[PDB]
Design a protein around this ligand. Structure first.
Ligand SMILES: CC(C)CCC[C@@H](C)[C@H]1CC[C@H]2[C@@H]3CC=C4C[C@@H](O)CC[C@]4(C)[C@H]3CC[C@]12C
Ligand SMILES: CC(C)CCC[C@@H](C)[C@H]1CC[C@H]2[C@@H]3CC=C4C[C@@H](O)CC[C@]4(C)[C@H]3CC[C@]12C
Ligand SMILES: CC(C)CCC[C@@H](C)[C@H]1CC[C@H]2[C@@H]3CC=C4C[C@@H](O)CC[C@]4(C)[C@H]3CC[C@]12C
Ligand SMILES: Nc1nc(-c2ccco2)nc2c1ccn2-c1ccncc1
Ligand SMILES: CCCCCCCC/C=C/CCCCCCCC(=O)O
Ligand SMILES: CCCCCCCC/C=C/CCCCCCCC(=O)O
Ligand SMILES: CCCCCCCC/C=C\CCCCCCCC(=O)O
Ligand SMILES: CCCCCCCC/C=C\CCCCCCCC(=O)O
Ligand SMILES: CCCCCCCC/C=C\CCCCCCCC(=O)O
Ligand SMILES: CCCCCCCC/C=C\CCCCCCCC(=O)O
Ligand SMILES: CCCCCCCC/C=C\CCCCCCCC(=O)O
Ligand SMILES: CCCCCCCC/C=C\CCCCCCCC(=O)O
Ligand SMILES: CCCCCCCC/C=C\CCCCCCCC(=O)O
Ligand SMILES: CCCCCCCC/C=C\CCCCCCCC(=O)O
Ligand SMILES: CCCCCCCC/C=C\CCCCCCCC(=O)O
Ligand SMILES: CCCCCCCC/C=C\CCCCCCCC(=O)O
Ligand SMILES: CCCCCCCC/C=C\CCCCCCCC(=O)O
Ligand SMILES: CCCCCCCC/C=C\CCCCCCCC(=O)O
Ligand SMILES: CCCCCCCC/C=C\CCCCCCCC(=O)O
Ligand code: NA
Length: 385
């Protein structure tokens, strides 16, 4: 069949993806620029990720369309157009890992987060990560390439000049680089590290939510212990544990905890004097403080943790969708490399895996719109105005 037919389908789909990747990701950048509620460290990595996706539309897709022709090119110029997408994928990986780490610092050490993670430090990390992405993605230009063993028969058949090759990705980029270096070391290891970080985020949230409920149950159980106590010593023992728990949870809400600790201290002083009935009556006053302050604190803390779980799930879905979209091309590369007795994956499947990898540059704006109210409302305001 005339090659122009299948190539026309591939090219049209690539151009459609390029348009959507540019539109959605420009909208993400626009939202962060205009809305100060979206201007935080986490979202500077989101913008770095959107910038890599805009460049997939502006540059990697025009380069992929050019490469699909197998046009004659100077081998090192061919390597640049073949490898530029690896720089963007590597930058995306560093941005995804930075977002996971940022979310883990936020849940594990919230009191130290604002002092540790600043916009100035994030901007430096983004700059370093872009430099490292160029070094990793363009490692073939440094000499790990097939330019020293050109396919001269293919170059002659196409009328290529001296020092030129038919510019085809698998002719110039070594598969040992694609599998061991690019895939195993630079993609799979960071994705497994991201998986580890997300597991730790969810475990930390689960433990912190369980600790909020345990402290609330302990306060209520100890009030009953005091109510059913048969002497001042049993009231004292229960108030001693309550005072320690109140101080541990204190590490309008500050006023509430001041009242709580004070009321426990009043009851404890009475219990130390052998005044069981007066100590039990003083301990009953803790219910007023629990109802007016402590319950509100517990609800607000639980709500905050639930918002962090929801935000970490949104971030993990984007990392998982990056893995889903890119794994097929990497897995095909593993078959090409490790199974030389296997027929190469057919050209239609190679085009499909490339298109799927490109589609990853369209999806993040949709995940933000569906899962993040602040993005959704800002997108609505930009589109309306
Ligand atoms: C700021 C942005 C938009 C600049 C983009 C510049 C791009 C399009 C340029 C920079 C380097 C260029 C390549 C350098 C060398 C060669 C080898 C030649 O035999 C065929 C063209 C080819 C493969 C060029 C294609 C276009 C190219 C990739
Ligand atoms: C990431 C998730 C969705 C899993 C994706 C698995 C894909 C990439 C797998 C599943 C079955 C695989 C194919 C199974 C058999 C062959 C025949 C062999 O001669 C070339 C590779 C080829 C054609 C494989 C390419 C990769 C393949 C298509
Ligand atoms: C956690 C998961 C997603 C990590 C990725 C798993 C990858 C590395 C696995 C999944 C399936 C595997 C392939 C399954 C079958 C074959 C055919 C064999 O003749 C050579 C190895 C090869 C080609 C394997 C290479 C490694 C492979 C591609
Ligand atoms: N086998 C291939 N693998 C890859 C690739 C990128 C990341 C993981 O695998 N890209 C490929 C091919 C064959 C063609 N291309 C490609 C690369 C860049 N521009 C167009 C096509
Ligand atoms: C080859 C073309 C150029 C490739 C590199 C492009 C890099 C673009 C990066 C932009 C992301 C910026 C995100 C915001 C950083 C923090 C802002 C700040 O706090 O000052
Ligand atoms: C989540 C990642 C899952 C990855 C699954 C990868 C695909 C697994 C299937 C492997 C089947 C390989 C069959 C190769 C047959 C070649 C036969 C031959 O030509 O000699
Ligand atoms: C969307 C599905 C098709 C993506 C482009 C692959 C075309 C393959 C072909 O050449 O027939
Ligand atoms: C985007 C869709 C535009 C397609 C224009 C024609 C491309 C082609 O068939 O070569
Ligand atoms: C590429 C496009 C990225 C979109 C982000 C824009 C920054 C211009 C700013 C105008 C204004 O602030 O009024
Ligand atoms: C392709 C490159 C696209 C450029 C992206 C930069 C957009 C910057 C928008 C966020 C700015 C945040 C801030 O100023 O604090
Ligand atoms: C910025 C937009 C860039 C769009 C084009 C991408 C690169 C196209 C390179 C074409 C090279 C053809 C050279 C030849 O005729 O041998
Ligand atoms: C938004 C600006 C950047 C996008 C520009 C898009 C340009 C058009 C798309 C494809 C690149 C051109 C492909 C050239 C193939 C040359 C093939 C050959 O020489 O045989
Ligand atoms: C900020 C824009 C960065 C643009 C890409 C910079 C790196 C380009 C790589 C060039 C390596 C030199 C190859 C020379 C071959 C002869
Ligand atoms: C051949 C390897 C070359 C390595 C260096 C190439 C140039 C890399 C620089 C790219 C972008 C610089 C940082 C942009 C983001 C700044 C965010 C604030
Ligand atoms: C750590 C990251 C460092 C990034 C900067 C890398 C510097 C060395 C790049 C040298 C490229 C020379 C061109 C290669 C060639 O022409 O064959
Ligand atoms: C991760 C570990 C990968 C090891 C691959 C070894 C392959 C081989 O020896 O052929
Ligand atoms: C290959 C694994 C890719 C995982 C990416 C991150 C997903 C996080 C999931 C958490 C449960
Ligand atoms: C996650 C960890 C993944 C590790 C994957 C290892 C793949 C190793 C494949 C080795 C194939 C050997 C083929 C041969 O000996 O012919
Ligand atoms: C969505 C559906 C995508 C279907 C594409 C791939 C599934 C596996 C097809 C394998 C085709 C190659 C078989 C062969 O080597 O002859
Ligand atoms: Na990306």
């Amino acid at each position: 069949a005339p090659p122009i037919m299948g190539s026309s389908v591939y090219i049209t789909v690539e151009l459609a993806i390029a348009v959507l990747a540019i539109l959605g990701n420009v909208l993400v950048c626009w939202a962060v620029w205009l809305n100060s509620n979206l201007q935080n460290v986490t979202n500077y990595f989101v913008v770095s990720l959107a910038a890599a996706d805009i460049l997939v539309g502006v540059l990697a897709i025009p380069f992929a369309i050019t490469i699909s022709t197998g046009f004659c090119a100077a081998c090192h110029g061919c390597l640049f157009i073949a490898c530029f997408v690896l720089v963007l994928a590597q930058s995306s990986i560093f941005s995804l890992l930075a977002i996971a780490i940022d979310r883990y610092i936020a849940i594990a050490i919230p009191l130290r987060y604002n002092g540790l993670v600043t916009g100035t430090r994030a901007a430096g990390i983004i700059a370093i990560c872009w430099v490292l992405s160029f070094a990793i993605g363009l490692t073939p230009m440094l000499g790990w390439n097939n330019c020293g063993q050109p396919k001269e028969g293919k170059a002659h058949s196409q009328g290529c000049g001296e020092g030129q090759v038919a510019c085809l990705f698998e002719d110039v980029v070594p598969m040992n680089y694609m599998v061991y270096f690019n895939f195993f070391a630079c993609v799979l290891v960071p994705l497994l590290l991201m998986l580890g970080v997300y597991l730790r985020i969810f475990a930390a949230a689960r433990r912190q939510l369980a600790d909020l409920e345990d402290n609330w149950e302990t306060l209520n159980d100890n009030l009953k212990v005091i109510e059913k106590a048969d002497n001042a010593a049993q009231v004292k023992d229960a108030l001693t544990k309550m005072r320690a728990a109140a101080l541990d949870a204190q590490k309008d809400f500050r006023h509430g905890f001041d009242i709580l600790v004070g009321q426990i201290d009043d009851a404890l002083k009475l219990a130390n004097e052998g005044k069981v009935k007066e100590a039990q009556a003083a301990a009953e006053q803790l219910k007023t403080t629990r109802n007016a302050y402590i319950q509100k604190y517990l609800e607000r803390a639980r709500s905050t943790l639930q918002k962090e779980v929801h935000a970490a799930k949104s971030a993990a879905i984007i990392a998982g969708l990056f893995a889903l979209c890119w794994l097929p091309l990497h897995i095909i590369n593993c078959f090409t490399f490790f199974c030389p007795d296997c027929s190469h994956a057919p050209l239609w499947l190679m085009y499909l895996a490339i298109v799927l990898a490109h589609t990853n540059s369209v999806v993040n704006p949709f995940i933000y719109a569906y899962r993040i109210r602040e993005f959704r409302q800002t997108f609505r305001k930009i589109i309306r105005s």
